[PDB]
Amino acid sequence: NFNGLKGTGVLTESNKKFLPFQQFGRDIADTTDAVRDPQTLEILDITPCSFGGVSVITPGTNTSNQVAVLYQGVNCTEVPVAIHADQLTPTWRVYSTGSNVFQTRAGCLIGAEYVNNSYECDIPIGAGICASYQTSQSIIAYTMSLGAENSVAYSNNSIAIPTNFTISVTTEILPVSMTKTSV
Amino acid sequence: KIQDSLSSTASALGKLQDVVNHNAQALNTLVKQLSSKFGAISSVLNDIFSRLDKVEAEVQIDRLITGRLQSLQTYVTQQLIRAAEIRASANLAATKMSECVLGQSKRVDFCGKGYHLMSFPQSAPHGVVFLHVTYVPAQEKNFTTAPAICHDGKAHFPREGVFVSNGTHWFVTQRNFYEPQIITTDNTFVSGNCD
Amino acid sequence: DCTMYICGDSTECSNLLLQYGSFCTQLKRALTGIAVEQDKNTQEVFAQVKQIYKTPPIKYFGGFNFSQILPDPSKPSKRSFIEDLLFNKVTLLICAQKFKGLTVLPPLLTDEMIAQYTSALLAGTITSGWTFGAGAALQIPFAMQMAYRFNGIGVTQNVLYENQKLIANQFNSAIGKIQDSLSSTASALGKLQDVVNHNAQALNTLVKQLSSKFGAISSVLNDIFSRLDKVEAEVQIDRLITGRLQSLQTYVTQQLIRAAEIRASANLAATKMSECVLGQSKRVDFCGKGYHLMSFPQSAPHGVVFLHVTYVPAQEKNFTTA
Ligand SMILES: *[C@@H]1O[C@H](CO)[C@@H](O[C@@H]2O[C@H](CO)[C@@H](O[C@@H]3O[C@H](CO)[C@@H](O)[C@H](O)[C@@H]3O)[C@H](O)[C@H]2NC(C)=O)[C@H](O)[C@H]1NC(C)=O
Ligand SMILES: *[C@@H]1O[C@H](CO)[C@@H](O[C@@H]2O[C@H](CO)[C@@H](O)[C@H](O)[C@H]2NC(C)=O)[C@H](O)[C@H]1NC(C)=O
Ligand SMILES: *[C@@H]1O[C@H](CO)[C@@H](O[C@@H]2O[C@H](CO)[C@@H](O)[C@H](O)[C@H]2NC(C)=O)[C@H](O)[C@H]1NC(C)=O
Ligand SMILES: *[C@@H]1O[C@H](CO)[C@@H](O)[C@H](O)[C@H]1NC(C)=O
Ligand SMILES: *[C@@H]1O[C@H](CO)[C@@H](O)[C@H](O)[C@H]1NC(C)=O
Ligand SMILES: *[C@@H]1O[C@H](CO)[C@@H](O)[C@H](O)[C@H]1NC(C)=O
Ligand SMILES: *[C@@H]1O[C@H](CO)[C@@H](O)[C@H](O)[C@H]1NC(C)=O
């Protein structure tokens, strides 16, 4: 509550320079981010507390009940610091000190063991990560698989011609209209 | 096989399912949204009249009429977006019916995965389902080729087809089915010398 | 997010926001549909192959030179020479948006495999021809594939082999100017800059909007309760709440529009790749200016850039006909 400037967050050392006149620093978002302590001329650095979107990775509810959790846009070493009673809105703080964690560009997901083999995507994550319920049975997040590679034996005197043909019926579905409604 | 494929899993009809789901889900929100008090004292009109003076009951109602009317407006706008999306799907469906069904289209990957032969439309609830019939080349054998051929000191070309040989002597065949033929002047036109 | 964008760090504000019900719970539903869609467009544009082909080590295609479009192993990232110019010319604080609850999720298909799919599409159209867009990939000599595209144009294939070296040198000089032309002006990539600009510009209004008064005593959330009595504070705070809530509604209903103008472009590109790249098309002036030989795709940030190779008649001699 610096001079009545109510706010919440964590304050660190700020390398930004204030002129002796200037008191409050403002960002592009037009809000305070740095304050000058009345007792100590050193400039603080206001930034909001640790937060972010909470994503749950779940298979079919009937299939299983383990649900790995992915944390959005946070360093994976920060959420262990966040663990404290009356300090975290979720009461399920067990996963923060939970199973083996894997860190990606979309934060680190907890409750799923990263397997370094390749599988086709079942549940999208982002940045080439796809969690799935595989083999006892748990949740594993792997890297995106683009399909098995297939070299072509190209040669400047070689040609390949199909000696046989097959007819396969392919389906395709398109909506044409929704329900007419009135209010 | 198509009979079993569609009925094997419920995810085959996914495109049609959310069209009737999003509509049936937006209505639920609209019905639920009238329960909101919208900052007023209550959420039912009759109690506002029965318990508040008409000089200031309008102010409480003002936050309710404007709140409900605006909430109704966002539902209509959420419908024009979908109407502009289905219209972009009906026209694509209309193009499929015009080209894939009523005729044959040489456009690759437009009426099936591969060469297109024909189609059969099928009626669907709030949509249409097509049955593309495709020609797909089967197992193949590679051969040794040559762009041209010289017989009388003069270049020779395939009139339509490609030149192939199994190792001993050459043959001309179609592009999509190995049907070798003896090289003949009828399948060949000369163009200049072979140097 | 709902609570912290409207009533952040204020338990005396988020409590009364529930009085509006699921009004902004529908906001997350709307912006989730656009989110998953941007991971669906890229799935149906760059991924029309079930195999990941690799070009042979030698790059001598009968006089044709493709070093400007094949992936470059020398660079640590598998990106083609043309790809490098596109990425540099496309330019994406960013942290301040996050602190207001405006996250930027990363796409499912990361940029590395996007240039890997494009490597596959450049590994079939130069070795296997257009037959790998219809089934089993079959190799043909690239000296012959011109005689097939030329056959569909209308000219007999004899004009090719009599003029192969002339064409290859003509092609080699043609692909080189694309490197110069793309970097010549920054307005060439204008159709991609505005896409990231409009998205970036829209967020600027949103963060600046929450500092507006909306007719209230003060735009600051906390000082309203700390300076005015509670009898009219709820009325006072209501028009501040509806100001931010309505502003979020305006942004989302405009963002859906921009999705539609992109969803339309995604389908156009998907047809372009299915026709202009995976084959030769008879749709005049649909895959470039002039008769169409083939096409080569190249990835780009938040977009795709094609390289149509069109056939244009040169000078002519008028004749007398019957
Ligand atoms: C590549 O294709 C050519 C064309 O079919 C093959 O040449 C032909 O081969 C068959 C048997 O493989 C020959 O038939 C036999 O000919 C002998 C000749 O004395 C005859 O006594 C037998 O009763 C039988 O009819 C056929 O004559 C021959 N074509 C010619 C013009 O001589 C060739 O064998 C194939 N090579 C490979 C490696 O597949
Ligand atoms: C295909 O074109 C590229 C582009 O010019 C060629 O790369 C050149 O290789 C020579 C070889 O000494 C170098 O001096 C040039 O500096 C290279 N160009 C660039 C832009 O770096 C490549 O050699 C060509 N390939 C074939 C087979 O002709
Ligand atoms: C057709 O046009 C091409 C180029 O558009 C001509 O090729 C050029 O010919 C001149 C003179 O013979 C040479 O100096 C150039 O080096 C050639 N260019 C290339 C890329 O090789 C060609 O001569 C023209 N043919 C006719 C019959 O007019
Ligand atoms: C339960 O979930 C499974 C998914 O493994 C599904 O196959 C099954 O139909 C579900 N049963 C229900 C929803 O009754
Ligand atoms: C956390 O920050 C450190 C900074 O040194 C960085 O090295 C690390 O990769 C970050 N981890 C995550 C999960 O963001
Ligand atoms: C891949 O995973 C296996 C088992 O999970 C492990 O033994 C191996 O060391 C891993 N490889 C790398 C390169 O980390
Ligand atoms: C095929 O390419 C190689 C690579 O340069 C070349 O040595 C060979 O002569 C070519 N084939 C023919 C038939 O010219």
Side-chain angles (χ1 to χ4, degrees):
Chain A
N1 207 0
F2 271 99
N3 304 105
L5 272 71
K6 294 184 257 283
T8 310
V10 289
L11 323 180
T12 72
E13 289 270 324
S14 56
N15 62 335
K16 62 181 73 175
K17 299 301 170 287
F18 281 180
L19 301 192
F21 181 76
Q22 311 157 327
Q23 210 183 10
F24 313 138
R26 292 259 198 81
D27 51 0
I28 297 89
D30 305 336
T31 185
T32 179
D33 80 321
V35 67
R36 176 181 305 175
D37 197 14
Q39 54 183 355
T40 73
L41 274 298
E42 201 276 338
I43 316 299
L44 298 175
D45 198 359
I46 294 92
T47 183
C49 52
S50 178
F51 78 115
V54 175
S55 300
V56 296
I57 305 303
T58 187
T61 308
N62 317 330
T63 297
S64 171
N65 277 52
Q66 329 182 42
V67 176
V69 163
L70 177 138
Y71 293 123
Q72 293 172 354
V74 67
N75 202 293
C76 197
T77 73
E78 180 51 66
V79 61
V81 187
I83 313 166
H84 187 273
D86 204 9
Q87 215 175 297
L88 280 197
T89 310
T91 66
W92 61 271
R93 294 159 33 245
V94 289
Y95 291 166
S96 193
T97 310
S99 167
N100 296 320
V101 309
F102 174 41
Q103 162 90 58
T104 67
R105 306 287 307 278
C108 81
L109 73 165
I110 308 186
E113 41 178 1
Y114 168 73
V115 286
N116 62 7
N117 48 340
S118 47
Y119 295 120
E120 205 273 331
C121 191
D122 191 9
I123 302 303
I125 283 287
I129 294 300
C130 291
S132 181
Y133 194 71
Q134 299 195 340
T135 72
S136 295
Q137 312 295 122
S138 54
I139 295 157
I140 51 164
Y142 39 80
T143 315
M144 271 285 328
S145 75
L146 318 173
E149 68 89 18
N150 185 2
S151 54
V152 171
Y154 157 78
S155 165
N156 48 12
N157 71 326
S158 166
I159 190 170
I161 282 152
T163 183
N164 204 343
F165 70 100
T166 182
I167 288 186
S168 86
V169 170
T170 309
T171 184
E172 194 171 3
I173 298 96
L174 302 169
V176 182
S177 70
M178 62 205 158
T179 79
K180 304 147 78 161
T181 186
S182 292
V183 190
Chain B
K1 208 166 311 302
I2 309 307
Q3 199 178 2
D4 303 344
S5 169
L6 287 174
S7 82
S8 286
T9 184
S11 55
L13 278 297
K15 295 204 66 170
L16 287 176
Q17 188 40 240
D18 64 346
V19 165
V20 72
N21 268 6
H22 276 168
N23 179 214
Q25 200 277 335
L27 272 296
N28 271 328
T29 71
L30 187 62
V31 163
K32 207 178 307 308
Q33 270 308 132
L34 63 85
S35 84
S36 160
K37 271 82 66 179
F38 280 94
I41 174 168
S42 195
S43 167
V44 61
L45 272 299
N46 291 337
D47 282 357
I48 309 308
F49 286 100
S50 71
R51 300 159 33 179
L52 288 92
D53 192 3
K54 319 300 173 291
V55 63
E56 57 87 20
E58 320 313 297
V59 162
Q60 291 285 337
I61 290 163
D62 177 30
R63 277 200 288 274
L64 183 62
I65 298 310
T66 312
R68 273 180 193 188
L69 181 54
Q70 197 276 334
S71 169
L72 186 51
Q73 189 78 41
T74 199
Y75 161 75
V76 159
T77 297
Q78 280 299 322
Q79 280 290 290
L80 276 297
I81 306 287
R82 292 179 180 90
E85 195 275 341
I86 306 298
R87 183 50 141 172
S89 183
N91 259 332
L92 174 65
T95 302
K96 296 289 183 68
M97 180 80 41
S98 158
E99 303 187 356
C100 310
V101 180
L102 289 184
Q104 180 179 0
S105 165
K106 275 82 73 175
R107 301 162 42 178
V108 192
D109 265 338
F110 190 48
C111 312
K113 178 82 198 301
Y115 294 83
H116 174 219
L117 274 191
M118 63 201 303
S119 300
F120 318 105
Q122 292 310 294
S123 71
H126 287 326
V128 75
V129 169
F130 289 94
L131 266 65
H132 297 328
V133 162
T134 52
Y135 172 100
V136 167
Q139 72 269 17
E140 75 278 7
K141 278 166 46 202
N142 49 10
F143 292 86
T144 68
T145 183
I149 174 176
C150 180
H151 164 54
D152 291 342
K154 56 192 285 291
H156 275 223
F157 281 63
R159 187 95 68 83
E160 69 273 17
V162 64
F163 276 128
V164 287
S165 178
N166 64 341
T168 313
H169 63 279
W170 295 85
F171 295 107
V172 62
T173 185
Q174 311 164 184
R175 279 80 179 274
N176 304 116
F177 195 75
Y178 173 77
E179 193 203 16
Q181 313 270 45
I182 296 94
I183 318 301
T184 312
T185 306
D186 49 30
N187 313 313
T188 297
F189 67 98
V190 63
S191 72
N193 47 10
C194 64
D195 291 356
Chain C
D1 194 343
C2 277
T3 61
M4 51 66 58
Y5 171 57
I6 299 175
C7 303
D9 61 270
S10 172
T11 181
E12 64 267 17
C13 191
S14 66
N15 49 6
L16 60 92
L17 191 60
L18 195 61
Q19 200 175 5
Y20 292 88
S22 71
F23 190 92
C24 77
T25 307
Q26 194 219 52
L27 267 288
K28 293 179 179 179
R29 177 186 296 105
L31 284 180
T32 304
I34 187 175
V36 72
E37 189 63 24
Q38 307 312 283
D39 279 335
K40 182 45 80 155
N41 294 347
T42 315
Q43 273 280 114
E44 74 187 58
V45 164
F46 295 124
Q48 293 192 357
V49 298
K50 294 332 161 163
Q51 314 282 320
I52 307 302
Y53 307 92
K54 50 174 61 176
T55 185
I58 182 57
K59 335 281 203 285
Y60 167 68
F61 301 117
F64 285 70
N65 186 0
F66 282 161
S67 73
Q68 277 283 334
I69 62 170
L70 265 291
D72 192 26
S74 71
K75 191 197 184 304
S77 276
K78 311 298 148 212
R79 298 214 303 247
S80 296
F81 293 60
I82 298 284
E83 299 278 339
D84 275 346
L85 300 202
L86 268 65
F87 273 90
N88 296 7
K89 290 273 263 207
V90 169
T91 52
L92 277 78
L93 294 172
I94 185 72
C95 299
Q97 309 156 2
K98 192 149 302 184
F99 292 165
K100 293 313 177 179
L102 280 298
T103 78
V104 182
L105 315 181
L108 161 64
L109 268 174
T110 198
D111 196 274
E112 264 308 317
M113 51 205 77
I114 293 303
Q116 162 76 319
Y117 284 164
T118 310
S119 161
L121 278 298
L122 276 296
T125 197
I126 68 169
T127 64
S128 200
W130 73 83
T131 196
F132 85 103
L138 324 170
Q139 63 279 29
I140 67 175
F142 195 76
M144 271 196 48
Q145 179 170 346
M146 270 316 106
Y148 275 19
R149 318 299 200 115
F150 268 36
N151 216 338
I153 291 306
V155 306
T156 66
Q157 58 183 262
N158 64 6
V159 66
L160 176 73
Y161 297 124
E162 291 153 19
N163 293 319
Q164 187 166 0
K165 279 307 181 185
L166 189 148
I167 283 176
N169 291 317
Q170 208 152 8
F171 187 98
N172 283 359
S173 174
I175 205 77
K177 297 186 186 298
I178 283 300
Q179 208 164 17
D180 296 334
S181 165
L182 279 169
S183 81
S184 297
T185 184
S187 49
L189 277 296
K191 287 190 71 174
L192 279 180
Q193 287 291 107
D194 51 358
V195 176
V196 73
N197 264 9
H198 288 183
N199 173 239
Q201 189 275 330
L203 272 296
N204 269 22
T205 73
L206 210 55
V207 287
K208 286 167 50 181
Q209 199 80 264
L210 61 92
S211 88
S212 300
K213 296 180 175 303
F214 293 112
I217 297 304
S218 61
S219 159
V220 289
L221 191 64
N222 63 7
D223 288 354
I224 294 190
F225 284 160
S226 82
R227 295 180 297 109
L228 301 181
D229 52 357
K230 277 74 69 177
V231 64
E232 51 87 21
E234 291 326 280
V235 163
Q236 180 54 259
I237 198 66
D238 191 81
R239 82 170 169 268
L240 184 49
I241 292 299
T242 198
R244 288 173 184 164
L245 187 57
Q246 205 279 332
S247 172
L248 182 55
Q249 194 73 215
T250 300
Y251 159 73
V252 68
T253 190
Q254 179 274 348
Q255 186 65 35
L256 268 165
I257 301 299
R258 205 50 43 76
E261 293 276 277
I262 288 304
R263 184 54 189 169
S265 174
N267 282 351
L268 172 58
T271 304
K272 283 268 195 62
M273 181 155 298
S274 301
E275 292 179 357
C276 316
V277 170
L278 293 195
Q280 177 215 22
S281 175
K282 297 317 286 164
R283 301 169 60 183
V284 187
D285 203 86
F286 176 68
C287 312
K289 184 83 173 303
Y291 304 127
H292 184 182
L293 285 192
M294 46 200 168
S295 306
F296 308 113
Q298 288 310 301
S299 159
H302 294 324
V304 59
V305 172
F306 295 84
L307 282 72
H308 309 325
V309 177
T310 71
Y311 166 95
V312 172
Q315 83 258 21
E316 65 275 358
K317 278 192 50 187
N318 45 316
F319 292 136
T320 298
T321 184

Short mmCIF file of all heavy atoms in Angstrom, two decimals, chain A residues 74-77 103-104 108, ligand 5:
data_model
loop_
_atom_site.label_atom_id
_atom_site.label_comp_id
_atom_site.label_asym_id
_atom_site.label_seq_id
_atom_site.Cartn_x
_atom_site.Cartn_y
_atom_site.Cartn_z
N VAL A 74 4.32 -21.18 -17.10
CA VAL A 74 5.03 -21.00 -15.84
C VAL A 74 6.27 -21.87 -15.84
O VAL A 74 6.27 -22.98 -16.38
CB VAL A 74 4.12 -21.31 -14.63
CG1 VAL A 74 3.76 -22.79 -14.58
CG2 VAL A 74 4.79 -20.87 -13.33
N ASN A 75 7.36 -21.35 -15.25
CA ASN A 75 8.55 -22.16 -15.04
C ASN A 75 8.23 -23.30 -14.08
O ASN A 75 7.58 -23.09 -13.05
CB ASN A 75 9.68 -21.30 -14.49
CG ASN A 75 11.05 -21.90 -14.75
OD1 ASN A 75 11.39 -22.95 -14.20
ND2 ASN A 75 11.84 -21.24 -15.59
N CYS A 76 8.68 -24.51 -14.43
CA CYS A 76 8.29 -25.68 -13.66
C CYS A 76 8.90 -25.71 -12.26
O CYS A 76 8.43 -26.47 -11.42
CB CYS A 76 8.67 -26.95 -14.41
SG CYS A 76 7.82 -28.43 -13.82
N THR A 77 9.92 -24.90 -12.01
CA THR A 77 10.50 -24.79 -10.68
C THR A 77 9.82 -23.73 -9.82
O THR A 77 10.18 -23.57 -8.65
CB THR A 77 12.00 -24.46 -10.77
OG1 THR A 77 12.17 -23.10 -11.19
CG2 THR A 77 12.68 -25.38 -11.78
N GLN A 103 8.96 -30.77 -18.90
CA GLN A 103 8.78 -29.36 -19.24
C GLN A 103 8.77 -29.17 -20.75
O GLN A 103 9.66 -29.66 -21.45
CB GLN A 103 9.88 -28.51 -18.60
CG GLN A 103 10.02 -27.13 -19.23
CD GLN A 103 9.15 -26.09 -18.56
OE1 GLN A 103 9.25 -25.86 -17.35
NE2 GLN A 103 8.28 -25.46 -19.33
N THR A 104 7.76 -28.45 -21.24
CA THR A 104 7.65 -28.13 -22.66
C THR A 104 7.50 -26.63 -22.86
O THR A 104 7.63 -25.85 -21.91
CB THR A 104 6.46 -28.85 -23.29
OG1 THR A 104 5.24 -28.32 -22.75
CG2 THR A 104 6.52 -30.34 -23.01
N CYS A 108 5.13 -27.06 -17.91
CA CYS A 108 5.44 -28.45 -17.60
C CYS A 108 4.17 -29.16 -17.14
O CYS A 108 3.43 -28.65 -16.30
CB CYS A 108 6.54 -28.56 -16.54
SG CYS A 108 6.05 -28.35 -14.81
C1 LIG D 5 13.16 -21.72 -15.90
O1 LIG D 5 14.08 -20.62 -16.01
C2 LIG D 5 15.45 -21.03 -16.22
C3 LIG D 5 16.28 -19.77 -16.20
O2 LIG D 5 17.66 -20.07 -16.01
C4 LIG D 5 15.55 -21.80 -17.53
O3 LIG D 5 16.89 -22.26 -17.70
C5 LIG D 5 14.60 -22.98 -17.52
O4 LIG D 5 14.61 -23.63 -18.79
C6 LIG D 5 13.18 -22.52 -17.20
N1 LIG D 5 12.28 -23.66 -17.12
C7 LIG D 5 11.01 -23.63 -17.54
C8 LIG D 5 10.23 -24.90 -17.37
O5 LIG D 5 10.52 -22.62 -18.03
#
